[PDB]
């Protein structure tokens, strides 16, 4: 909308679009402001007042996270997401405390002993450059999802495992649905810490009782 423009009106054998007032340049007499014009203004310009976020009831958020946690212990769902678990003895996995690990070298040896080798390899081999214009806008590489580790108490193991591709970490008390159901499909593979697994009873309570940690919520 920058330019000085006006319509020539009828009687000149031309369409009555606004035109640019100028002289000495090829720009004289060209068609100015409308959406059907080169260099004109777009239809309904995009605007900051749009509603970016969305609400969801707290009671649904609580219930969805509870049944996402449940699905992490049904083999049919875990396999269905594409985690491969052929070599793993039993689900769920619960690592002890008194893990005194500090180095990544010894950290991987632990994970291999739980049967996770094929799963981890599946992630490392996956790295590829994205198709389309997203590769220009800071979203260049894509990787497959792998195990999530959940802890509750501060331990050295967290900074021993984190550089291994596809390993992900969160605390039990603030466990998110984006981490528990990626892409909106449920049944992510989870490594529990022994403290964290016991805490699930305080957090979600018992059937037909009220949780002390989540006020006003019952299963």
């Amino acid at each position: 909308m920058r330019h000085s423009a006006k319509s020539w009106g009828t009687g000149r054998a031309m369409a009555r679009v606004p035109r640019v007032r100028a002289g000495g340049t090829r720009r004289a007499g060209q068609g100015a402001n409308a959406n059907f014009c080169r260099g004109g203004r777009m239809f309904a310009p995009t605007n900051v007042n749009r509603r970016w976020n969305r609400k969801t009831l707290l009671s649904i958020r609580r219930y969805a996270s509870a049944m996402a946690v449940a699905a992490t212990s049904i083999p049919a769902y875990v396999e269905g997401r594409g985690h491969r678990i052929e070599q793993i003895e039993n689900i769920p996995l619960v690592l002890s405390n008194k893990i005194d690990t500090e180095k990544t070298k010894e950290g991987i040896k632990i994970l291999y002993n739980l049967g996770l080798k094929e799963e981890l390899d599946k992630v490392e081999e996956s790295k590829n450059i994205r198709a389309g214009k997203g590769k220009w806008r800071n979203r260049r590489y894509v990787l497959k999802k792998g195990p999530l580790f959940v802890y509750t108490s501060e331990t050295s193991f967290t900074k021993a495992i984190r550089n291994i591709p596809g390993v992900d970490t969160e605390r039990v008390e603030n466990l998110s649905i984006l981490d528990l159901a990626p892409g909106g499909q449920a049944g992510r593979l989870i490594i529990w810490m022994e403290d964290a697994f016991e805490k699930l009873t305080e957090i979600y309570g018992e059937m037909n009782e009220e949780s002390k940690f989540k006020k006003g919520y019952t299963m």
């Binding site: 220009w136 800071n138 260049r140 984190r162």
Partner: protein
């Protein structure tokens, strides 16, 4: 992962920083690895290539060749090595430039300030290594 928020991870910003570099930052672009023996003769692991030094080409058309560095083009980041050339229709021969990182140093040119440059870097290490 990066936890410092003052350093950029934008593709657009990293690329501009590369090509518009000047001064000492430009010199950092001309670094090459030293061979295993020289890494015992001197403390350093890598140095900026200069005329008169002796290099093995480890990638490309001229792989396996050895020779003396003739010239260093800073604007178009390339090094000319003695005896790496192409012949035109005329029979005339033109030296083809190689990117620094495809080379490896075999003998160092010790003319001029090189001995002081090396000393300055060794001291900078030890100062913090021994602490």
């Amino acid at each position: 992962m990066k936890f410092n928020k003052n350093v950029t991870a934008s593709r657009r910003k990293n690329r501009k920083a590369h090509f518009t570099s000047i001064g000492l930052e430009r010199t950092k672009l001309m670094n090459a690895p030293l061979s295993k023996d020289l890494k015992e003769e001197y403390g350093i692991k890598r140095i900026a290539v200069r005329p008169g030094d002796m290099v093995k080409v480890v990638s490309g058309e001229f792989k396996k060749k050895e020779g003396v560095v003739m010239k260093v083009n800073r604007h178009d980041i390339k090094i000319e090595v003695e005896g790496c050339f192409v012949q035109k229709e005329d029979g005339k021969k033109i030296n083809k430039g190689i990117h620094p990182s495809n080379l490896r140093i075999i003998k160092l040119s010790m003319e001029k300030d090189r001995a002081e440059i090396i000393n300055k870097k060794v001291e900078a290490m030890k100062s913090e290594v021994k602490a």
